[PDB]
């Protein structure tokens, strides 16, 4: 009934989330794959109406959405900032975040971990024992992505350069600078804890950050199932294409699979009929692997859209919301790209250290009750003080820090004790 | 555009032979999408009005000689801020 | 004919012990449990905290204490009553079985 | 333009909210539905392909999914905390939830 | 088809479920788990527990 436990210390913990954002676009030629150079099947199949024009409608939206997954992402900021010559921020390293010009590709120590370690088939490229490449028979091919890998990453340094020189400050309006040493206290001031403890433990605090961010490299990496959501999309996408060109092996009732031998085995009235059996089972193989991409593909949509509601609430503003960005109290969060997906390190204060102490819930003083102003009251066993409340830092009760009302009398658990006023004691000298 | 072929076989099969009898002569250029056969490729560099793929768009845009021309989209403009 | 309902993972026994042990750290922690290790709050100082996070001082719950826990001693009381005593207040959970 | 209401009291509501979070999980074997099983249509559904071997994955991610749905909503604690032997709270009465 | 027609209206109803239990991880954590400003996100008045 009157005993609190108060953090002494704190932690810097910075985590990770990957979401998927975008899946393949692909496009099917209905009659090359139904019927194939035969011209008997192409007019046979005039008889079951617009069930390939319906069919290409779907597919072709499904694709269009594709694009729009990507650009409500990264898409999000208005020019495209990049970062100082001198890279001093206060003591904080941001090398294994940040661009490498060196390498080709301007991506940086960790965005390129990522990429190799997602293997793949989505081949738009003009450039085809090979790879699913096989599957590019039949009516069926891969399209390729509008924003190329280079453009995506060019979106993410932009993202990850104003907010290491301008805070949040880019995402309400025009991009105005502020130190980073001081962008990281007004972000300590919003989780509840003071400037004070920023300014005097900066170089702890940059330490457990630089420490924590150069863990993620190994983590992620070494432990190799972590890109797990990201590869199935790849893995889901082609054994739903390979199944697909694997059912024209099949005959569904009839004297083979090869439209050709039975018009090479039969005459002018039976083929009309063993070829309907093909023009069916074949009709329907297409007519599942299109609701089943449109079942895949509102999922993915999903997926999309919390990714684009947490860099506009995680990565260009500090959120309040439990668990949305991390474990702990949110201080910052900042974007990487992935293969068909989006990674975010987020950065968050985990209270540590918490020392037992007594509690009263006000102090009486001369027939007048005192309340805290903006932290608790606490004693070490002989005086008490006025502490905040998520970090130990005593002070003495005066009538700077406690608001009065009332009498020592409503309240069930008043304490005496005496809170010095400041004037009077000067009015003595 | 044709989409998915190297613009070395839709002229050497324009020289039949290709399906889409009808056929075009302006200016073959080759994209990671296809081949673009109608539009000429300029260096600079703006937003994008029609979409081709692989960070290639489309305009028509006055020259007034008025053509299609092609070009690589630009992301936005730059802005660096005075940190300091 | 070939059809067989599998069973869940985690018994409703399991299920109920995870709703316990969240409700034995809110009622005895606060919101502290949820972002590093729980730390212990007097209860009535805990809801003073809650009434200045929606706009109000904490003199009007200390000076108040005894009607506001009778106000809500009696609001959980009358839940039986509804949610059971309205057959079809459960109906959502009802229509996927 | 010049009037202000300004509240002289206050109540404590407590209300009600029910949400589903896990379904059915069921799985069917082709063969016995379709081909009574007992019968030698196994070898005139042979000639249909993978049609029998997609349902089968397709019920395993639907049935693996709703084991997922309930260990975010309920397993989110790290430790099993248990409330004091003694249970007064300040004059609140948890008898009815705990 | 029968079976087809079955296995196609489960995974549309279970789209709809992973919604339902993925609002309810977001009220545990955000209305249980802490106190929210979210204006009828977790009931009717101004939140407390």
Redesign the interface.
């Given at each position: 009934?009157?005993?609190?436990?108060?953090?002494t210390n704190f932690t810097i913990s910075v985590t990770t989330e990957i979401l998927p954002v975008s899946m393949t676009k692909t496009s099917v030629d209905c009659t090359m794959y139904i019927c194939g150079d035969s011209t008997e099947c192409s007019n046979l199949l005039l008889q079951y109406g617009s069930f390939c024009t319906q069919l290409k409608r779907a597919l072709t939206g499904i694709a269009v959405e594709q694009?729009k997954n990507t650009q409500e992402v990264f898409?999000q900021?208005?020019?495209?900032?990049?970062?100082?010559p001198i890279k001093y921020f206060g003591g904080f390293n941001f090398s294994q975040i940040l661009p490498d010009p060196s390498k080709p590709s301007k991506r940086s120590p960790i965005e390129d971990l990522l990429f190799n370690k997602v293997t793949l088939a989505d081949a738009?490229?003009?450039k085809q024992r090979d790879l699913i490449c096989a599957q590019k028979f039949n009516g069926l091919?891969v399209?390729?992505?509008?924003?190329?890998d280079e453009?995506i990453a060019?979106?993410t340094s932009?993202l990850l350069a104003?907010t290491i020189?301008?805070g949040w400050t880019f995402g309400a309006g025009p991009?105005l600078?502020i130190?980073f040493p001081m962008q990281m206290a007004y972000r300590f001031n919003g989780i509840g804890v003071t400037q004070n403890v920023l300014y005097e433990n900066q170089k702890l605090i940059a330490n457990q950050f630089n420490s924590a961010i150069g863990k993620i490299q190994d983590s992620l990496f070494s432990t190799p199932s972590a890109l797990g959501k990201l590869q199935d999309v790849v893995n889901h996408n082609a054994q739903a294409l390979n199944?697909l060109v694997?059912?024209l092996?099949?005959?569904?009732?009839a004297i083979s699979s090869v439209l050709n031998d039975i018009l090479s085995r039969l005459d002018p009235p039976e083929a009309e009929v063993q070829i309907d059996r093909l023009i069916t089972?074949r009709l329907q193989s297409l007519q599942?692997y299109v609701?089943?991409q449109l079942?895949r593909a509102?999922?993915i949509r999903?997926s999309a859209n919390l990714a684009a509601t947490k860099m506009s609430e995680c990565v260009l503003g500090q959120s309040?919301?439990?668990?949305?960005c991390g474990?702990?109290?949110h201080l910052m969060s900042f974007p990487q790209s992935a293969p068909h997906g989006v990674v975010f390190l987020h950065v968050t204060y985990?209270?540590?250290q918490?020392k037992?102490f007594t509690?009263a819930?006000?102090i009486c003083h001369d027939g007048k009750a005192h309340?805290?102003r903006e932290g608790?009251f606490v004693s070490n066993g002989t005086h008490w003080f006025v502490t905040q409340?998520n970090f130990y830092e005593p002070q003495i009760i005066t009538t700077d820090n406690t608001?009065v009302?009332?009498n020592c009398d409503?309240?069930?658990?008043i304490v005496n004790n005496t809170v010095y006023d400041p004037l009077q004691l000067e009015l003595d000298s | 555009l044709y989409?998915?072929?190297?613009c070395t076989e839709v002229s050497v099969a324009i020289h039949a032979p290709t399906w889409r009898v009808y056929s075009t002569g302006s200016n073959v250029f080759?994209t990671?999408?296809?081949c673009l056969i109608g539009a000429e490729y300029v260096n600079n560099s703006y937003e994008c009005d029609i979409?081709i793929?692989?960070?290639v768009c489309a305009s028509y845009q006055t020259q007034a000689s008025q053509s299609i021309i092609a070009y690589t989209?630009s992301?936005?403009?730059?802005?660096?801020?005075?940190?300091?």
């Open positions: 009934n009157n005993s609190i436990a108060i953090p694009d898409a900021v208005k020019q495209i900032y990049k970062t100082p738009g490229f003009i091919t399209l390729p992505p509008l924003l190329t453009m060019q979106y932009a104003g020189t301008s991009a600078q130190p199944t694997k059912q092996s099949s005959k569904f009732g089972g599942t609701t089943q079942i509102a999922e999903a309040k919301r439990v668990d949305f474990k702990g109290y985990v209270p540590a918490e037992n509690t819930p006000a309340f805290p608790v409340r608001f009302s009332g409503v309240v069930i658990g | 989409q998915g072929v190297n080759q990671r999408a296809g979409p793929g692989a960070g989209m992301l936005g403009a730059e802005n660096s801020v005075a940190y300091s």
